[PDB]
Amino acid sequence: GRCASSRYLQVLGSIHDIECGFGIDNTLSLNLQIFTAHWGHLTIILIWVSSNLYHIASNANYSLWVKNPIPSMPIAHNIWDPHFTNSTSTPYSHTIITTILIAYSGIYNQLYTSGFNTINQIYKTTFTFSCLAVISILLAKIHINTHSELLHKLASHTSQIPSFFQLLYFLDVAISSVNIRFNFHTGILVGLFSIGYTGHLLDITIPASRAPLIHTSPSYLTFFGGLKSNTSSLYLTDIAHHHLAIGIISILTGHLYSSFRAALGTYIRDILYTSHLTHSIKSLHLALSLILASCTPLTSTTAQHIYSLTPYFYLSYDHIYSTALYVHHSYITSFLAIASHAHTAITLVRDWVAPLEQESSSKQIRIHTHKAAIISHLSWVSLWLGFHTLAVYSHNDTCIAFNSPSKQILIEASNGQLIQQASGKALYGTINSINNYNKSFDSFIHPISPGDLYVHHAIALGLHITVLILLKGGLEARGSKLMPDKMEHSFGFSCDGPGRGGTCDISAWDSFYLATFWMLNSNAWISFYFHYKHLTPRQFSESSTYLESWFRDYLWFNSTPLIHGYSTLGANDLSVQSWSFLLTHLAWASGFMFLISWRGYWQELIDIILYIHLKTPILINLWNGDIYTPLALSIVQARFIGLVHFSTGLILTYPPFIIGATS
């Protein structure tokens, strides 16, 4: 016997699930594979950085954008596509000149702020980052060899006593050690990296931004505030001082755990054992979940503070950079946030040992004892938020459709206004006690209106429901009342049969699949809020309390330039935006059939098609189907493929709209 066509999907669904590998027999192999994969991924990141730097160096106009950044537009890379018109000139080129694309990433402001002035510096930087990619791959090879050499040194290893087998658990102490990793991460990788970047700023960035000054004196460490007037960005001296302070704090903190000597520092196990934790820190899924849950606030605050307090030169002067960066980082942090819950569920399925029935000692145990209370209260708050946001929006829509704008229910956002007032009083007290006052903070505090209150309630509803689905999946991954053996099965499995009431979407993976739709919807709400307030603050402040305003004055109204891109009147430089808009609509709708239509129909359809192929004159004498038997996609594969189509469509439909509306 052999396999069917579903082998490809089955293999690719766990192609990186190194725990599911067949040759892997021990944590040594798993940890070494993960470490080597980390090295390869770092190489990929470095090559990507070098790629962007090269294309800015070669197929771009950094040397000219740096001179007049406010009205100029950067170039991403050239367009070489043989499908364009070999005659005339495309709307993306100045007549006979080559074809170009406008960069919406923001690397131009990054390099300008960091101190780049010439193309030659960018070329040297590209070369150095390619060198670093080589170094990373060679480090991967080095560590593979060192661990294989330890394994070979077990050919000259014996304790002369039966305790020699204890060495089995310490072979991967290089990777699995936690105290040393925490100490050196928090100290070196955070604090000293910040201190080195402060040195970079003081040596290059501040010297290459103003007239020549003293030999990088300590007057380069200022405490001004935000939004230097000329470049509309944070003071580079303030940034250097901030990185210096963070570096000092994290360097001091990095001396906490017992890393290299047994006589200094406290152990993480003893820290947890005397607190409300003591979790299984040897689980890789648990660590991954709680560090993905750490990159999530970091990325969300990155999205918030790149816009609110623009740190790069002339970044606020670009109407497309500011929206694209915020939306990108919001989507990245939403993905990481749902990742944290997905891997928490995988941790509970795979890497969690629980007491017999009643020992309420582990934190997961105490959570599982009253998990029903958690889920019931999360459902209650989700229901309240949904009911009272949709109902008030419906009131506003109905009363404004009935020619009565004054009959709306507009709750003044008093709590957010109080927080803003307190923060503004603090900031104004800071500013008034300065001999160099009249500072600006850009959008750190923004006008808050009833529309803001309603949108914040909608966002809270989305977050609550996403957390509800993910938390329910995590807590009932090991067993629910409907299926009280769920931890005997895989993390993702089809169903439990039509009996016992019917059990579609019962696995924890199915809970993740359901929660990804809500993650996408909440992110869409957040992005729509930001983009609408960005396009017209006045119209958002007044007419955003009724959903018809969102439907008309934002979606229908702002989609005018994009659809007009390519038509029977000529093309604009938004032609790619409109074409990708339609393509992403097609991708989004194509995944509906993988979600709505389920397997058996298609399996019968595939049986009919296979009947045809085994009935066609020439095919039957070459291919009997016994080798790679065509079969319909399995249930979990179908749900995942539909989810991928839906996610791709929903995500990639937005950047064309952003570019058409802002540019």
Ligand X SMILES: CC1=C(C/C=C(\C)CCC[C@H](C)CCC[C@H](C)CCCC(C)C)C(=O)c2ccccc2C1=O
Ligand Y SMILES: CCCCCCCCCCCCCCCCCC(=O)OC[C@H](CO[C@@H]1O[C@H](CO)[C@H](O)[C@H](O)[C@H]1O)OC(=O)CCCCCCCCCCCCCCCCC
Binding-site ranges for ligand BCR (CB under 6 A) = 40, 43-44, 47
Is 240:146 a contact under the CB 8 Å cutoff?
Answer: no
What does the binding site for ligand X look like in residue numbers (CB under 6 A)? 8, 593-594, 597-599, 602, 606, 632-633, 638
Q: What are phi and psi of 524, to 5 degrees?
A: -65, -40
13 binds, among ligand BCR, ligand X, ligand Y, none (CB under 5 to 8 A by kind): ligand Y
Q: Which does 339 bind (CB under 5 to 8 A by kind): ligand Y, ligand X, ligand BCR, none?
A: none
- Exposure string of 480-500, with b = 16+ CB inside 10 Å and e = fewer, is beebeebbebebbbbebeeee
Select from ligand Y, ligand BCR, ligand X, none the partner in contact with residue 12, using the beta carbon and a kind-dependent cut-off of 5 to 8 Å: ligand Y
In whole angstroms, the minimum distance from the beta carbon of 513 to ligand CLA comes to 8
500 scored as a contact of other proteins (CB under 8 A): yes
Closest approach of Cβ 360 to ligand X, in Å? 32
Residue 537 binds ligand CLA, judged by CB under 6 A = no
**Terminal alpha carbon distance of the chain:** 59
Yes or no: say if 658 and 531 are a contact pair by the CB < 8 Å rule. Answer: yes
- Is residue 98 at the binding interface for other proteins, with CB under 8 A as the rule? no
Q: Which residue has the tokens 């019962």?
A: 506
User: Coil, helix or strand for 461?
Assistant: helix
Burial of 352 (0-12, 13-18, 19+ CB in 10 A): buried
Q: What is the 3-state secondary structure (H, E, C) of 540-604?
A: HHHCCCCHHHHHHHHHHHHCHHHHCCEEECEECCCHHHHHHHHHHHHHHHHHHHHHCCCHHHHHH
Q: Which residues between 602 and 661 bind other proteins (CB under 8 A)?
A: 611, 614, 620, 624-626, 642
Distance CA 346, CA 474 (A): 8
Q: Does 445 bind other proteins (CB under 8 A)?
A: yes
For residues 536 and 590, which CB has a smaller minimum distance to ligand CLA in the complex?
Answer: 590
The answer to whether the CB of 247 falls within 8 A of the CB of 198 is: yes
Token pair belonging to 307: 């816009």
How far apart are alpha carbons 107 and 352 in whole angstroms? 43
| Token pair belonging to 468 | 């509800």
Closest CA to 234 of 86, 113, 339: 113
SS3 (DSSP) at 99: strand
517 binds ligand CLA (CB under 6 A): yes
Indicate the residue among 40 and 561 with the shorter CB distance to ligand BCR.
40
CA distance 66 to 141: 41
Q: Which is nearer to ligand BCR, 54 or 326 (CB)?
A: 54
Q: How far is CA 503 from the centre of its chain?
A: 32
Stretch near ligand CLA under the rule CB under 6 A, chosen from 218-226, 227-235, 288-296, 456-464: 456-464
Q: Is 495 in the site for other proteins (CB under 8 A)?
A: yes
Q: What angle do CA 631, 634, 637 make, to 5 degrees?
A: 125
611 contributes a contact to ligand CLA by CB under 6 A: no
Q: Which of 167, 188, 221, 249 binds other proteins (CB under 8 A)?
A: 167
Question: Is 252 an interacting residue with respect to ligand CLA (CB under 6 A)?
Answer: yes
DSSP 633: P
Q: Which of residues 274 and 435 has its CB atom nearest to ligand CLA in the complex?
A: 274
Q: Which of 78, 398, 634, 648 binds other proteins (CB under 8 A)?
A: 398
The option from ligand CLA, ligand Y, other proteins, none interacting with 170 (CB < 5 to 8 A, set by class) reads other proteins
152 touching other proteins, by CB under 8 A? no
Q: What token pair was written down for 585? A: 């609509």
260 binds, among ligand BCR, other proteins, ligand CLA, none (CB under 5 to 8 A by kind): none
Beta-strand pair 566-567/99-102? unpaired
Asked if 281 and 272 count as a contact pair (C-beta separation under 8 A), the reply is yes
Q: How many CB atoms neighbour CB 157 within 10 A?
A: 11
Per CB under 6 A, 636 contacts ligand Y:
yes
640 binds ligand Y (CB under 6 A): yes
Task: Quote the least distance from Cβ 233 to ligand X, whole Å.
Answer: 48
Phi and psi torsions of 166, nearest 5° = -60, -25
Enumerate residues 176-205 that contact ligand CLA by CB under 6 A.
Answer: none
Q: How many residues does the chain have?
A: 663
Q: Is 510 in the site for other proteins (CB under 8 A)?
A: yes
Task: Report what 127 binds from ligand Y, ligand CLA, ligand X, none; CB cut-off 5-8 Å by kind.
Answer: none
DSSP per residue over 299-310, as a string?
HHHHHHHHHHT-
In sequence order, what are the beta bridge partners of 102? 75
For residue 488, the 8-state DSSP code is G
Least Cβ distance, residue 314 to other proteins (angstroms): 17
In the bound complex, what is the minimum distance in angstroms from residue 409's beta carbon to ligand CLA? 10
Nearer to other proteins, 294 or 404 (CB): 404
Within 8 A by CB and 6+ apart from 53, the residues are 107, 122, 123, 125, 126, 129
Query: Interface mask (CB under 8 A) for other proteins, residues 172-191, using x and -?
Result: ------xx------------
Segment near ligand CLA (CB under 6 A), from 226-234, 481-489, 492-500, 590-598? Answer: 590-598
Considering only 251, 445, 644, 663, the residue that binds ligand Y (CB under 6 A) is: 644
Out of ligand CLA, ligand BCR, ligand X, none, which partner does residue 465 contact, by CB within 5 to 8 A per kind?
Answer: ligand CLA
In whole angstroms, the minimum distance from the beta carbon of 434 to other proteins comes to 9
| Residue 615 CA neighbour count, 13 Å, CB half | 6
Q: Tell me the per-residue interface mask from 461 to 500 with ligand Y, x by CB under 6 A, - otherwise.
A: -----------------------------xxx--------
- Residue 572 contacts residue 564 (beta carbons within 8 Å): yes
407 binds other proteins (CB under 8 A): yes
Minimum distance of ligand Y from residue 95's CB (angstroms): 36
Residue found by looking up tokens 């008093």 in the block: 414
Distances (CA, A) of 467 to 168, 342, 351, 405, 473: 40, 11, 21, 35, 10
> Of residues 77, 181, 305, 446, which one binds other proteins by CB under 8 A?
446
Q: Quick check: 330 and 523 in contact, CB under 8 A?
A: yes
Neighbours of 389 (CB within 10 A): 19
**Contact between 590 and ligand CLA per CB under 6 A:** yes
Tell me how far, at minimum, the Cβ of 124 lies from ligand CLA, in Å. 24
Q: 326, exposed or middle or buried, with CB in 10 Å at 0-12, 13-18, 19+?
A: buried
The residue (of 101 and 221) whose beta carbon lies closer to ligand CLA is 101
From candidates 25, 81, 357, 626, binder to ligand CLA by CB under 6 A? 81
Q: Which is nearer to other proteins, 85 or 568 (CB)?
A: 568
**CB of residue 118 to other proteins, shortest distance in Å:** 35
Task: Return residues touching ligand CLA (CB under 6 A).
Answer: 79-81, 83, 101, 252-253, 255-256, 264-266, 376-377, 379-387, 390, 411, 413-416, 448, 452-453, 456-457, 460-461, 465, 468-469, 514, 517-518, 555-556, 575-576, 579, 586, 589-590, 592-593, 596-597
Task: Return residues touching ligand Y (CB under 6 A).
Answer: 9-10, 12-14, 490-492, 634, 636-637, 640-641, 644, 647-648, 651
